[model samples]
Target: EDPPACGSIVPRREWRALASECRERLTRPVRYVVVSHTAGSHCDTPASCAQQAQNVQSYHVRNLGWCDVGYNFLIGEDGLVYEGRGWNIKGAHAGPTWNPISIGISFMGNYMNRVPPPRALRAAQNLLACGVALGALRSNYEVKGHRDVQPTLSPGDRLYEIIQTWSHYRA
Candidate 1:
């Protein structure tokens, strides 16, 4: 379904309005918004860089062809912003409970070995600013690496540095 303003998800067009309403509700200031990127699991970026070319299309285990879009919003290696999931919906990106509560964002590159392009990192910062303005998160959102939650080494070491920098950059 789709809203007259935002367009549709399925053919019925009802998802649009539903999603828009969801967006409105989710815009409330949320506390402890945990964000994470894929590819940090198992250090795949460093150990098996060759296999990661398909990682973006690989994580959709739960959503039935939807979850693996990498994140709700994906910052491409080319620095392009692509929608991973609709804003109105919950992402299954973060582990179990966290997925429904936190805003999960994933960058397209596996940062252990392959660094994200400058433009994409910049886009991520911009996205964070927008999320803060929308009341979806706090200005002092505690940016964290995926490993902060689970035992996986996701979000790459170098990239985590950049993610850390975000927590410090002034608005």
Candidate 2:
């Protein structure tokens, strides 16, 4: 049988995540996967991506005063997935309605004009597959661009277009 979770991806401890203080757990078999972009900086190196992940958490915890980073997971151009809130907790990503029911995965860069490399895209798809295997998400889960649910250009234009063609994307 497969692992109980997607632990093959980078672990939260490896990325130096602060202990989570998030109080709520998302309802199981989450039906939505909301894709977003940091719109900040990108990292392709292991060292750089680790720091980038920390920076995101800092902004959310210290600046935004959230319990943890806004995203449930963050994908890097380094072709790695950096754990944020992981699969069990609610994320502060899109909005109240979607936050409690979706897993928010964000790309660690501005994708308005830049396309993520193939390796980066592959990692994301793999993550979704893992989620399905773990039963954290529905087998027929829906992928939604950040812009699809919220009035924001998140996940960026280029990335937005890319996910549109994905088999699971709903809009």
Stretches of candidate 1 above 4 Å error? Answer: 1-27, 32-35, 40-70, 168-171
In candidate 2, position 147 carries an lDDT of 98
Model 2: which ten-residue window has the lowest total lDDT? 1-10
Q: The CA-based lDDT of model 2 is what?
A: 0.93
Residue pairs clashing, model 2: none
Candidate 1 at residue 29, lDDT?
A: 54
Error of 2 at 49 (Å): 0.3
Against the true structure, what is each candidate's TM-score? 0.63, 0.96
Q: How does candidate 2 fare on TM-score?
A: 0.96
